[PDB]
Amino acid sequence: RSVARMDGDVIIGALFSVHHQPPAEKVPERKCGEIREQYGIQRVEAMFHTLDKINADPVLLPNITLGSEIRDSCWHSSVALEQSIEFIRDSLIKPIAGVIGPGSSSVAIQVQNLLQLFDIPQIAYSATSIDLSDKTLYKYFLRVVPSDTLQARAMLDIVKRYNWTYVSAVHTEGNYGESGMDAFKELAAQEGLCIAHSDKIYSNAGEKSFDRLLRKLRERLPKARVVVCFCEGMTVRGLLSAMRRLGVVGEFSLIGSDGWADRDEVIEGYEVEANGGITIKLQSPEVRSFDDYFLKLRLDTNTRNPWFPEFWQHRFQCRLPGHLLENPNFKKVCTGNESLEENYVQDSKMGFVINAIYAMAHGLQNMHHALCPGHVGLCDAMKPIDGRKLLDFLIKSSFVGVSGEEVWFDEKGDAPGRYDIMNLQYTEANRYDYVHVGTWHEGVLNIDDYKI
Amino acid sequence: RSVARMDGDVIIGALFSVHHQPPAEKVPERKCGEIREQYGIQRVEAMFHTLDKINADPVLLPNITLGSEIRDSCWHSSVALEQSIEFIRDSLIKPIAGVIGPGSSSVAIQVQNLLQLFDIPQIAYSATSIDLSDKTLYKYFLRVVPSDTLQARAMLDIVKRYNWTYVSAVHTEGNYGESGMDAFKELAAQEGLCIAHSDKIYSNAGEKSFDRLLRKLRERLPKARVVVCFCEGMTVRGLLSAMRRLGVVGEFSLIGSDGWADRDEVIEGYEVEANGGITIKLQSPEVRSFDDYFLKLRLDTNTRNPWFPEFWQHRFQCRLPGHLLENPNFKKVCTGNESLEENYVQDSKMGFVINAIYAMAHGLQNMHHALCPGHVGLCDAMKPIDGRKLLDFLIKSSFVGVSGEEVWFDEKGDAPGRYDIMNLQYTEANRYDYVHVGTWHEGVLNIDDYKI
Ligand SMILES: C[C@@](N)(C(=O)O)c1ccc(C(=O)O)cc1
Ligand SMILES: C[C@@](N)(C(=O)O)c1ccc(C(=O)O)cc1
Numbered sequence: 001r002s003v004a005r006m007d008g009d010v011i012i013g014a015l016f017s018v019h020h021q022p023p024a025e026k027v028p029e030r031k032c033g034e035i036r037e038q039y040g041i042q043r044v045e046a047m048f049h050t051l052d053k054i055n056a057d058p059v060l061l062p063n064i065t066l067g068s069e070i071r072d073s074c075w076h077s078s079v080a081l082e083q084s085i086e087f088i089r090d091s092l093i094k095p096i097a098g099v100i101g102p103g104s105s106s107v108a109i110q111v112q113n114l115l116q117l118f119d120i121p122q123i124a125y126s127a128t129s130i131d132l133s134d135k136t137l138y139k140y141f142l143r144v145v146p147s148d149t150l151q152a153r154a155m156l157d158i159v160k161r162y163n164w165t166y167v168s169a170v171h172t173e174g175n176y177g178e179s180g181m182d183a184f185k186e187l188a189a190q191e192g193l194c195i196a197h198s199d200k201i202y203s204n205a206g207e208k209s210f211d212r213l214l215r216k217l218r219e220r221l222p223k224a225r226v227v228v229c230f231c232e233g234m235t236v237r238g239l240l241s242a243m244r245r246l247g248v249v250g251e252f253s254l255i256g257s258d259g260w261a262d263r264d265e266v267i268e269g270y271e272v273e274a275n276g277g278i279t280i281k282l283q284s285p286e287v288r289s290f291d292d293y294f295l296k297l298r299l300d301t302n303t304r305n306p307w308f309p310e311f312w313q314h315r316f317q318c319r320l321p322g323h324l325l326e327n328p329n330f331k332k333v334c335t336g337n338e339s340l341e342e343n344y345v346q347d348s349k350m351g352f353v354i355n356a357i358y359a360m361a362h363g364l365q366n367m368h369h370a371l372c373p374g375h376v377g378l379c380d381a382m383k384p385i386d387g388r389k390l391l392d393f394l395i396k397s398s399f400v401g402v403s404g405e406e407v408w409f410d411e412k413g414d415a416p417g418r419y420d421i422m423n424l425q426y427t428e429a430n431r432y433d434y435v436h437v438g439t440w441h442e443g444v445l446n447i448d449d450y451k452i
Numbered sequence: 453r454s455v456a457r458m459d460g461d462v463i464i465g466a467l468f469s470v471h472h473q474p475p476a477e478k479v480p481e482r483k484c485g486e487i488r489e490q491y492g493i494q495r496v497e498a499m500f501h502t503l504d505k506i507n508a509d510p511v512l513l514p515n516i517t518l519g520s521e522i523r524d525s526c527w528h529s530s531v532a533l534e535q536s537i538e539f540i541r542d543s544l545i546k547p548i549a550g551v552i553g554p555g556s557s558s559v560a561i562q563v564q565n566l567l568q569l570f571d572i573p574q575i576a577y578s579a580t581s582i583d584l585s586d587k588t589l590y591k592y593f594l595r596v597v598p599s600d601t602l603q604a605r606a607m608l609d610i611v612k613r614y615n616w617t618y619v620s621a622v623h624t625e626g627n628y629g630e631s632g633m634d635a636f637k638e639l640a641a642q643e644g645l646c647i648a649h650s651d652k653i654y655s656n657a658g659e660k661s662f663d664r665l666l667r668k669l670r671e672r673l674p675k676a677r678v679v680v681c682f683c684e685g686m687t688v689r690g691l692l693s694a695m696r697r698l699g700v701v702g703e704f705s706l707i708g709s710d711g712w713a714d715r716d717e718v719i720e721g722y723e724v725e726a727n728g729g730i731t732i733k734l735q736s737p738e739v740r741s742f743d744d745y746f747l748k749l750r751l752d753t754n755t756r757n758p759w760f761p762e763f764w765q766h767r768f769q770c771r772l773p774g775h776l777l778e779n780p781n782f783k784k785v786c787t788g789n790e791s792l793e794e795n796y797v798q799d800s801k802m803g804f805v806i807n808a809i810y811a812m813a814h815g816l817q818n819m820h821h822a823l824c825p826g827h828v829g830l831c832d833a834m835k836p837i838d839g840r841k842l843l844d845f846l847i848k849s850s851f852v853g854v855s856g857e858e859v860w861f862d863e864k865g866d867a868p869g870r871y872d873i874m875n876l877q878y879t880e881a882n883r884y885d886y887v888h889v890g891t892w893h894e895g896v897l898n899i900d901d902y903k904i
Pocket of ligand 2: 555556557558578579580581628801
C-alpha cells in the first residue's frame, strides 16, 4: 500500500483518507475502495503545501526543515491501525515525532490507543466525539476542533434567545447522537427547560419506524413544536420523508446538530418540509493560499503524491497509455491538459487540517526554544525527540490560525468552540439554500434577526 | 535482540524476562541488564520442554505439532511492547496464535492493550493485579492465577478465624497495594470490622517516613495491634527496621500479602521484630519432569536457546575462547563441564508457566474438535486461526494441571484461588523459619491450630 513522504529533520506523520473504506467482505484482506479527492488527494496535497510554507518561513522553525510521512487511512480502523503500526515500529527502530489525523472519531480512538503505548502525540481535525476529552483514557490525543459538548451548549443557547420554554428531542443511535443529547438534556434541567417528547432511531431503520416516530412527535402539540435534533444527516432526511408520506408539512421548527449542517444531500427533494430549520455547522473559513496551489498542479510536476496519477484518471475519467497506474473503466485519453477547476470544490474542513499541522510545528518550535537555548538547529537534547515532553509543549502552545482564528488547547486537548448558525430558506432568487445568519464565539450567541 | 524460536503447525508466542530491565537512563535506547536464570533461561527452557512433551503426547493435539516464538521482555513495558509489535506485525503479514506472559502485571496490562487491537489472546501466570478482571477494558486477557481480590478475601478470612474485632491497615503505593487494600476495606464494613489506623508509603521512602509510620501505628494501642499489611516486600522489611531503630520489638502481629510471602530477603537480619507474622503465599508445587530436563542441558546440545551461551558464562563466571558471546568480566575458562546442579533452585512459579502453556494447547485442542470434526490435521476453517474464536474455546477450556491441580477460568478469565498460609516461627531446631501452617482452597480456610 503506497505511501506519501517528504524528507526533513523532524518528520510529522499523517493519516488522511486517500481511498474509500473496504467493502463489507473485503475487510479481512484489507482492500480499500476507490480513491477520493475531497477527503483525500486534497488532504494529502495540503500537507505538502502547508509544509512548504512553514519550511520557507523565516520566523517559525528557522533552520529546522520539516518533513512528513502520509499514510492512507481508508477511513477504517483496521487499515488505520495497520499503518499506525509501521509508524511506531519504523520509529521504535528517521522516527515519527507526531501524527495528524485520522478523520473519523470512532477511528481516532482506535488509533490513540495504539499511539499512547509509544508516547506519540496525535492531533486531529474532525474527530469531535465527547470521549476524547477523557485524558485518563486518551492522554496523548488533542484536536483543533471543539468537542460536541459545545454543540449542545450552542443549540441550547439558541433555544434560549427565542424564549421557547418547551421543546422536543430526537437523537440518532451511536456514540454521537446519544452523547450529544444526554449532554443537552443535562443543560436542560440546570437551565430550566422541559422536554415534551423524546425518541431515538438508527439512520437505516425502516420507513415504518420513521412514520411511528413522526406520529409520537405530532401527538404532542401545540406545545412540543420545537424539535431539537442532535441527528445524523440521514436521520433528519428520513424525518422529512415521514412528513411527505403523511402529507403534512410545516408543523415543527427543526434545530439539528452538525450532522445536518448545510449538507445539500440531506434535503434534496424535501426542500419543503425542511425549510425553516436551523443547523449548527463547524465554522471553517475558506483558504485561498490552497487553491492557487492545488489547481495549478500538473501531472508531470507532482512527483511527491504517488496517488495523483490514479486520482487524475478517476477525476477526469480517462486513461494513460500503458502506465503502471492505468484504469480499466475508461476509454478516452487524458490530454494531460484538463483543468482541475471544473466542478471544483474545496474541502469543507481544510482550515482545520492546515491548522492541526501548524499546531504541530508550534509544538516543536516552542520545544526547541526551551530545550535548545542558543542552539541554531536541533540540539542533542532533541535527538531523539522525547514524546511525553513534546506533548506538554503542544498543549501549552498557542498561535494565530491560517485564516486568522485563535488557536489553543485546554487541559484535556480540546479546542475552543466556534460554529456557524445555518438557516435553510428560500433566497430572494429562486432556490432553497442554506443561508449563513448567525455565529457562536464561545458562549456569545449572535444572529441577524433580520435574516430569519 | 535475539529470539528463541521452535517450529510447528501452530506457533505460540511468549514474553519471558530473559534479562533484567534497562537501567534508569538506558530506557531510551532500550538496552537491558544482565541475564537471569530464575525468571529467564528456566522460563524459556521450560517452554521447549513442555512443548516437547505435548508434541510427543498421543491424546492432546494428535497430528498438529506445536511451535513457538519466545521473545525477551526485560521485565519492562518498553521492550515488551517493542517485541509485542514484531508479534502482531509478523502476523498481520507463520503468525502467532497466542501469547504467554509477560511477568509483571504493570506490564501485562500494557501488552494487553497492544494485543487486543489485533484480537490476540494473552494468557498470564504471575500477573495478579485486580484491574485485569475488567473485560470491558482487558477483554483478551486471562491468567492461570487468582487475582489479588482473593488475597484480601483470604487474609480477612484469617482475621475472622481469630475473632479479632479491631485491626490496623498498611499498604504500599501502586496499582498493587492500593487496589488490594481497598478490596479488603470493602470486605471490612460488609463483614463487620473496624480499622483503627491506616497509612501508605512507597518502598523507597526515607527511613524517616518509616519511623513516622511506626509512630502513627504505635500510638494506637492496645487495640490497634493486628496490622493488616497488603505490602510490597521491601515495605515490610522497612517496617521491621523502623522497629529495630526504635528499639521496640513485638508490639504487633503482622499479616502480610504475598508481596512478603516467604521471601528470605525480606526478614534477613530482622528475624526478630518479624517473627510471629503470617503471610499468604501462592500455592505452586514443585515439578520434577523439568529438573531431569534442565540440569542435563549441555553447552553444545542446546541449539534452540540462542541465549544459553551468554547465560552459561554468567552462571559459572568463566568465558569462552573467542566466542561471539564472550564476557569481559571473567578470566578463567569454562570447562564446559560444570554441573548446573550447584546452588540450583527451581523457579518458584514454574508450575504456573507450564500450565499457562498447557491451557494454551487445550484451547486449541478444543477449537479443533469443534471446527474440524473428523479432520486429522488443521482443516481449512483454522487456516488461518481466528483469534476471537480461540478466545471462547480457551475460556471454556478445563483440564488437569501438570502437578494434578484443577484448572479452569470463570467468565472474566480469572483462575480459582489457592494459597498457602505461612507463619514465621522458631523451629524446634535452632532457627527462625517460615512454617507451612494452613491452606486456602477457594473460601475454605484450613489451619493446624496446633502448629501456631
Ligand atoms: C460523526 C462525526 N461528527 C465524527 O465521528 O466525529 C463526523 C461527521 C462527519 C465527518 C465527515 O464526513 O467529515 C466526519 C466525522
Ligand atoms: C507486582 C506483582 N505483585 C504483580 O504484578 O502481580 C508481582 C510481584 C513480583 C512478581 C515476581 O517477581 O514473581 C510477580 C508479580
